[PDB]
Amino acid sequence: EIVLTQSPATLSLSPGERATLSCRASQSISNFLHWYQQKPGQAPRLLIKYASQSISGIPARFSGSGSGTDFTLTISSLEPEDFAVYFCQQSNSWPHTFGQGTKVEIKRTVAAPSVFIFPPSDEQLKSGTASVVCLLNNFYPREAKVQWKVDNALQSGNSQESVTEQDSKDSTYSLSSTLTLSKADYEKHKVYACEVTHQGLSSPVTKSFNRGE
Amino acid sequence: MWNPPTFSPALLVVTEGDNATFTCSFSNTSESFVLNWYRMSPSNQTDKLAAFPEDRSQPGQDSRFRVTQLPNGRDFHMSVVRARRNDSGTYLCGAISLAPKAQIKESLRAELRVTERRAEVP
Amino acid sequence: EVKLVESGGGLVQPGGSLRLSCAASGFAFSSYDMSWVRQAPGKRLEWVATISGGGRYTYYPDTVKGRFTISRDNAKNSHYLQMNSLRAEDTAVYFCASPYGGYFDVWGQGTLVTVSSASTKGPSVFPLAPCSRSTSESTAALGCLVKDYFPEPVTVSWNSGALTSGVHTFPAVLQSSGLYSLSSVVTVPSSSLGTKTYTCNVDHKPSNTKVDKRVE
Ligand SMILES: C[C@@H](O)[C@H](N)C(=O)O
Ligand SMILES: [Cl-]
Ligand SMILES: [Mg+2]
Ligand SMILES: [Mg+2]
Incomplete structure (x- = not known):
């Protein structure tokens, strides 16, 4: 199949700024390259057909360019309504394939997360399982590192993370990390620590509790 | 796409008010295709008049530019209804098909001449 | 059209x-x-x-x-x-x-x-509260962990919809068990942890279950 590779994964821009989105095909596809916009929970919306032809009714700020392997969607000056995911799609040959998308997200000033650790409840520890939760509240940009340390031992393979959509009012992200152990494994250890690395801080912040207290 | 479509006749002359019918011919087995009718602008822009089937994204269809598939499936009438003197110009058709790859091919161009109607002889 | x-x-x-x-x-x-x-x-x-x-x-x-x-x-x-x-x-x-x-x-x-062999089950709802209620900080976080339910979705509100500001309900994650888990958190004034009550309201229509969990 033809593989389409979009770059960058995320563009972080302010309203009024120019957005340049790249789509590279694994083989030459002449002008058979189309562009779409997609917002959460919605179908994609067609913007550009045949690399450079603008669909009737699309704003003039959108324009497509390229031929062969290298294609570009340009948004000359971003409106708020333009923060969305953009996909390219080829119809050169079968199967018709899509790129992985570029997300155009809102720039705002750097905001360090507020960080909170929550021990497992006594109710849950009756059930035979311990969930330890680490909350990173209202940060920007999206890039973060959360590490769990239990009596200094770096944990791997026993946590899951979940991130909110960019907040409609303050443009930040929030993130949960959940560390899950059996009650038996949880009771072997004393100090539970969440270590968060983010651009808004000079160094990592460590939030911890002692299981005994 | 094995061959480009054909567009005939090369020169079509009609009297203003009458209809002018070209034929776009495109051999097909009813595998997906789009057939476009174009007129050249005075600045060499290919301007779309009509499509088979209709472009659902275009803002609407001028009623005077009609495309009719004939029974053999290969021949399409492309008709200017109630032709005007300022319909005189250069016309063509183009096809898009997808298998085994995508290709976009245009016909040779043809000329339409729409003449001035002669008055009753005084 | x-x-x-x-x-x-x-x-x-x-x-x-x-x-x-x-x-x-x-x-x-x-x-x-x-x-x-x-x-x-x-x-x-x-x-x-x-x-x-x-x-x-x-x-x-x-x-x-x-x-x-x-x-x-x-x-x-x-x-x-x-x-x-x-x-x-x-x-x-x-x-x-x-x-x-x-x-x-x-x-x-x-x-x-959604392709899964999991059977319908209502969530277990656990409080998320800090190890110590005393804090030197102006702000405190509280929440509910909504664990081990199937299928999606759940609805979470706080204080029956009266509390919307500062709330983050995270997208569910699918655990290796084939059951979903999510957390809902809110940030609140530390001064209020004495006074005001905070209750998560968790509804799961597939299991016909409703939970209210007071968090402290
Ligand atoms: C006689 C008149 O009707 C005619 N048109 C002519 O000029 O000869
Ligand atoms: Cl608008
Ligand atoms: Mg469309
Ligand atoms: Mg998590």
Whole structure:
């Protein structure tokens, strides 16, 4: 199949700024390259057909360019309504394939997360399982590192993370990390620590509790 | 796409008010295709008049530019209804098909001449 | 005026079968190709079938060949995707769409198909509260962990909808057990941890369960 590779994964821009989105095909596809916009929970919306032809009714700020392997969607000056995911799609040959998308997200000033650790409840520890939760509240940009340390031992393979959509009012992200152990494994250890690395801080912040207290 | 479509006749002359019918011919087995009718602008822009089937994204269809598939499936009438003197110009058709790859091919161009109607002889 | 509307998505067991349908209006249905395109979480859009105007030609990618069949009923302005031998990897939003010379210029709304052997179960709701209620900080976080439910979704509110500011309800994660887990948190003035009560309200319609959990 033809593989389409979009770059960058995320563009972080302010309203009024120019957005340049790249789509590279694994083989030459002449002008058979189309562009779409997609917002959460919605179908994609067609913007550009045949690399450079603008669909009737699309704003003039959108324009497509390229031929062969290298294609570009340009948004000359971003409106708020333009923060969305953009996909390219080829119809050169079968199967018709899509790129992985570029997300155009809102720039705002750097905001360090507020960080909170929550021990497992006594109710849950009756059930035979311990969930330890680490909350990173209202940060920007999206890039973060959360590490769990239990009596200094770096944990791997026993946590899951979940991130909110960019907040409609303050443009930040929030993130949960959940560390899950059996009650038996949880009771072997004393100090539970969440270590968060983010651009808004000079160094990592460590939030911890002692299981005994 | 094995061959480009054909567009005939090369020169079509009609009297203003009458209809002018070209034929776009495109051999097909009813595998997906789009057939476009174009007129050249005075600045060499290919301007779309009509499509088979209709472009659902275009803002609407001028009623005077009609495309009719004939029974053999290969021949399409492309008709200017109630032709005007300022319909005189250069016309063509183009096809898009997808298998085994995508290709976009245009016909040779043809000329339409729409003449001035002669008055009753005084 | 041109519309496509999907029906049919839901839960299917691995190895099982599901049929989706798409109803068209506002254009000459038999004149156009019809398609299905799927979107799996974390995955690129994937075209999975096309049928020609007259139904004589069908196309599929190798990933669904022999399992999926696209068909249409031109008199009913509808097309269908019969999906056999479904696997975990087929879980996705399935969009009906209609291409025109290579690109998709009409789309449906998407219908979710979820492939799982899990049985319905209401969540366990646990409080998220700090080790110590005393804090040197102006702000405190509280929450509820909504664990081990199936299928999606749950609804979470706080104080019966009176508390909306500072609330973050996270997207669910699917655990290795095949059950979902999510947290809902809120940030509040530390001064209030004495006074005001904070209750998460967690509803799960598939199990007909409702939980209120006071957090301290
Ligand atoms: C006689 C008159 O009707 C005619 N048109 C002519 O000029 O000869
Ligand atoms: Cl607007
Ligand atoms: Mg988590
Ligand atoms: Mg469209």
